[model samples]
Target: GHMEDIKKISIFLAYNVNVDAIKYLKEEDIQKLIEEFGEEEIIEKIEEYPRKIKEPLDFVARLIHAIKTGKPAEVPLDNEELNKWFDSLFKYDEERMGGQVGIIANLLAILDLKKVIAYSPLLSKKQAEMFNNDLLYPIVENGKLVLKKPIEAYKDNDPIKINRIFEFKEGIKFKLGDEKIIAPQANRFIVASRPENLARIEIKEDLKKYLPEIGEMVDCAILSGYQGIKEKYSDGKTAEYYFKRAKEDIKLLKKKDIKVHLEFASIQNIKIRKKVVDYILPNVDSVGMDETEIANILNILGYEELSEKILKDSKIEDVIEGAKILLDKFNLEVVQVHTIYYILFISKKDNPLSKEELKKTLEFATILAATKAKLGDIKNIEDLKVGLKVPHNKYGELLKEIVEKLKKKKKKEDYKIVLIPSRFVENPKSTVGLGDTISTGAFVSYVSLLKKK
Candidate 1:
């Protein structure tokens, strides 16, 4: 049960190589693509910003939409010509690694920050090979991914599948206080991956059985809600499956004296949200989610009217109070809400992390996230430290005010709250996986530092 004795951390349930489809496109290329693959009646020759295209074809539609309308559009990948054209654009860059667990595991390993064990219900040979060659820490055998464990490997016969998720966005930079994203957003995210086969099976049984086999190395396990286990679109039964598995996994991990951490993303379905709050929240030890995700959760909990007001007013107290409501409602040991500018966390009395540990956790997370944002991805631990010298942002003033307010009523509050400002980057190279990097960095660094203490 000691911190120093813990050696492995497990990150779960999603793996795919992300292709930044728009990272290489230019205006001329979009025009050329339209000229070559443009089909009649597919597009109405839209020629203005903020214009809507009805049933545009494939990735071509997304490109034209961004070029003309300057808005995000999720177009179907039904046209072969458009798909091939888009594929040719990012063929090389598509080899780059991605996914929540994959990114977090590599970041931790490369930085030499901690030992990470990743678990994905579906990992292709190519994905496993990339993880092995790049990180040189993972071992794959019999189609199972293991982090150099004593058990070598477990039997996982799930069919391997490749996912071609795509995202296209102009490299525009902006601050966090605008309260609204300006026009020309031009950012489109589409998951071409076959959701029906992507981590869609029962993972709780596999995870529960395998963790004990890995023995005491696994001190903590991290789970994700990106896929919903119920497929891209969730029904009540599928939602129930995800929630039930999560509950069982949490119970098993706790029974083995392992800590449980749940990470949330932008879940759009109300059924998934209901299951997560009603069934999953009560079983976990900690939860991490971004401001948008927390807002979604709050809205789902019949707080949409209040959430709209909170966002409009941008009241620091309202945000903190909202976080408090979640923390108390779930009876969770820890709740972390990350925003573009800062991170706010609340810890109940039963939480194991001390005040100093919590501060260091946020500090390390802030630095790691800033570095990842500025450089797209972290290659080595040495490079990640390069961000520590970056100057602090003015957002600290707001965090300072929030912390002061908390201090004034600490006696009445049952939990401790800490607000740490993020290290601002004017034009970040990438926006993807910053949350996972930050959360993983904070969790691993905190656990490692606590062990040393």
Candidate 2:
């Protein structure tokens, strides 16, 4: 129970820089583009597209097709083409930084402000140095960022692989002649693809090749972005390999009773999604995902209507019910479903949570999420509670009700549910890493408090 003594959180295995393209578009422009290219057909193609672009040429072709056809492109464009698109489409702005792993790691570090030991690959020289100087080295001592190989910790290579993320600015709606449709600015329109993350199908082989040489020293292990590994070099047939690696990683850590937490961003492939729910989910101790992810999972499980209900209007009861189903199905120790307004955590009796500790955890997580939403990034971890705004009025009331009800409910099943109010930033400065920020922050708090108790 000596959790305070545990200092390291081992995060892996996809790491890359991003070239985010920002823009604000008009509805007429969107309509024009759609009309120019057979709107409904483009939607059909995207919905039916089974796999992500893995080849550079294919990625480029997708972008060009979108530009030429004035339709939504699957691949993100960059530099002049990207700039030209924004210029031609609408008024826009832009920024660039680390993606998935980099953003997650940065926020986690800020929340804890502690030294982190990471196992990542594919960072170019500029990215490596930028992350080191801009994010990692500024907070902790002596090269905390660790790679699997002896490649220069500071030396990144040429032809840097960076994903281009194009996000439409807020309040930008698509005007299609007479109808106006608001864009969901929270979603990232990515322009690039991931590189090969594994060398072989075997867990040991891939781990031996890409993972750090750490020998059971970390306190907590985070498995994230397995989609990269699942899709690379396999033509969308290597999901089994990805899950095997996850299971093997879990086995390796469970040898020392290290806590394993899994977080998934987006799983586009329906087959891979099914395999994760069927094979990988049950293997992990805890899992965190957003409302969309939860819906997609339930839809894959043949609960299409129920899934649609959860997404259309996520009432507290609906979330709790979904959590109950998922908890039973996976028999997971913990399941966290986070939304913009609130977070719901369902856990088995074996790992019951105290009210006070849960409240503290939620508060910290809210602070982290709000900070990220307000600033687009987290630079400092101190005084996190200062200048913090509480949840929206509706959210606060819902959370109060959930807490009181949880206190009153007798144990009916093998599990219990806890809901906490999270802030809904009116104008979210950044949405990319909010999930990672909240999940990691709350998890760290929960573990730390459990240890103290």
Candidate 3:
């Protein structure tokens, strides 16, 4: 085989690349390499004369085995004795390998510096500079701080060594142009469909007239669409015809620039529909879709700001840490039992039920509980009425603000708002609507999300 082929094969084998392709290499060729220097010797050669490599764990294991068994093995010359290597056997001598030595030395320094910073409460610029000089310079030129163990490189144009250069290559060009950094708000939507009670209702049969009232109720006018379904109900209910009405409603709503999110049941009631778009539904079934999964959905919608923070890390950890944090705050015998029940149901439900996600959800819950406790013997809504920061009373106001902004933007999304109370309450299966209710709950959770540790 050509040397290029062998190089490719070696790279692949070293990295545990495509297994099927590696299987095609001849066993004889492999055994000859092993017989010449043994498995341990080959691995050492690869590391000491590496193009780019790490010492493999398997090779280290085998080397240790040889040493322990008293079996003679060809070990690479000790790294410290590099200056003494015989001329013919050595290519790049120790003098030229100082960069490699610097790489290792700096890594150790960086680690020590990290330890110091972590243990100390805070570091001043001057104090930190003292650590950098003592620990960082011997390993890195100019004391440029960076992640540990990186193979430092600078830009060069040598053809064979071009790829080895890390910083830049080929062309060095940059643009200075007009740019803006805009942090955007999360979108809002209005959830709408033929209410189950109104299926098969004609667009002109006084049903369409309710569009204005329905729009006023939610504070947006709705358009009636006739989206027909595939199956007709028994006794000529013609429920499927509601699908036709849905189409008209969608057009009317879209003309007003109001986005409507179809209820999941309406889309999935029939196995299939005549048109693909007609059968579309929101991710209402499971935590199949929600604010949590907005990034993935936005990718489908071609949004550039997919990197915007959707959830905070501590809040996520709160969910993962689970019930343990609650135990710290609540010691009541009944409360402990209730915490157990909450974890059992909400622990892995994905809609904040996943162990880690629930940890966050409960973390928020505990924050609200803590705020309530601190208020000291609150008797009624009057006590909560005084605009304490836990988001109990002001959440409805916040929701109204978001809705008003959505109206100004004239974006298409279907949504409604409801409140999740701070008090402990039974959660019905239909508590699916809790999302609508728990927007308020979420506002409270974010107060915890923003709390400083």
Candidate 4:
């Protein structure tokens, strides 16, 4: 990707941007929380999700479960009290911006796109400071839209929400009550308070008020952060209400005829997940997720057997087959899945980029993932080139393996497929935001090239 071409693209990213208090889980951190809260109480609460956390013990319970199962989990929290307790309990050793929109917005600003408008209602000074100066958030001043970076336009009273990310590696064992448990794979679990529900359900009022003008200035929008939705909230509003509101915002984007990409997460509410898949998802132009999330989608879509196959991570062919199912089932133009080893995209006349352009785009995304994994951060444009130095499995061999399996089933050429092996990093600085990073990086990278071409 040339610098000159990269500078010509514009995209809008929305919903959430918060600080990530990232830390690796050590024996002491776990042991202390367990000891303070009592072993039985902590272990009992760690069972599963569709759950919520109120106090310190409740927070530790869900996190411990994530470590034991090696799955990413998110739970609704009480927010202020818990947020305050969690902050004082542990030092935020390393801080970075997080959430799907947050990471994408910050990274794209560094990639230096022509206009990177990141929308967040809770844009406090602290949260605003975490973003690059180039990222803009528009607010109506004197009854007209004004483009200004978050640092200058952030709301004076907005709170800085902090998300604590705990990363674990495969085979690392820790004692939970009487049993010594081992993590199944390398993953990170998130524990954060939900952002204000209104910000999540609709576009910021100012942005929505000037949708046409804002839409004219951008080529694409990355929409996310709806994973926090539940069956019902304390306000007695149903999940359907939020879904409807979100779809209204989606429809406006569709009217503009611009590209829309929806990023999925490990949404714990099964019913809410179904609503999103069946309704909100079909409105967008493209979508993306990781392996586990794909499995979760399959589970709800009545593909239980295929969903199980995906969780294993040993079967590349099954993953491809699953991607195909997602493409056909949704009748979506594009479905991309990002995994530790490789990233693949399946398209049915909806993808904006051609197959060869997708190959180039996905390759750029993989290198960016590698660079982030190795260095724990992508500081500037130079880091994009640094991904080439990381060691990884050969792309040709992995491609051949998939080809042989597909041929055995006589299912080649049914749909366009593009796969690229990632540059593997054994000890990553963090794993929480890699999925968002990959999708955002690839989209901007490709659009930049296309605009200049």
Query: Global lDDT for candidate 2?
Result: 0.57
Q: How far off is residue 358 in model 1, in Å?
A: 1.6
* Full-model lDDT, candidate 4: 0.75
Clashing pairs in 4: none
- Span of ten consecutive residues with least summed lDDT in model 1: 174-183
Model 2: per-residue lDDT, tens digit, 1-453? 132222334333233344344543344545555666554555555445434453233333343234333434455333323434443443336545556656665555554533444434444465554453323211112534233321244443333555554444435555433444454433434555454532322334444422333324455556665555454454555657666666665666566655567775686777767767776687766778888888888887788888989889866677677777777787567788888778777777666576555666666677777877777667765445431763543766566687567657765646556676777778666666678778877777666665555
Query: Candidate 3 versus the native: TM-score?
Result: 0.22
Q: Which residue segments of model 3 deviate by more than 4 Å?
A: 1-204, 209-218, 221-230, 237-239, 257-432, 439-453
Quantify all predictions' global Cα lDDT against the true fold. 0.58, 0.57, 0.26, 0.75
What is the overall TM-score of model 2 with all chains considered together? 0.72
Comparison by TM-score, 1 against 2, better one = 1
For residues 1-453, write the lDDT of model 3, one tens digit per residue.
111111111000000000000011122333443554455565555345432122333333333233223333323222212312322221221111011112222222332222110101112232222222322110123533232221122123211100010111112221112211121211111111221222233344433433333222121111112222335554465544655454454444334322232211122332332232232222111111233323323333344243233323312212222222222222211001112112111211112222343335443443333333445322233433332344333433443354346445645422221112233322212222232222222322322222212
**Residue range 337-386, candidate 1, lDDT tens digits:** 77777877788765666776787778878887888888777786566566
RMSD of 4: 4.1
lDDT of 3 at 244: 47
The model with the greatest lDDT is 4
What's the TM for model 1?
0.78
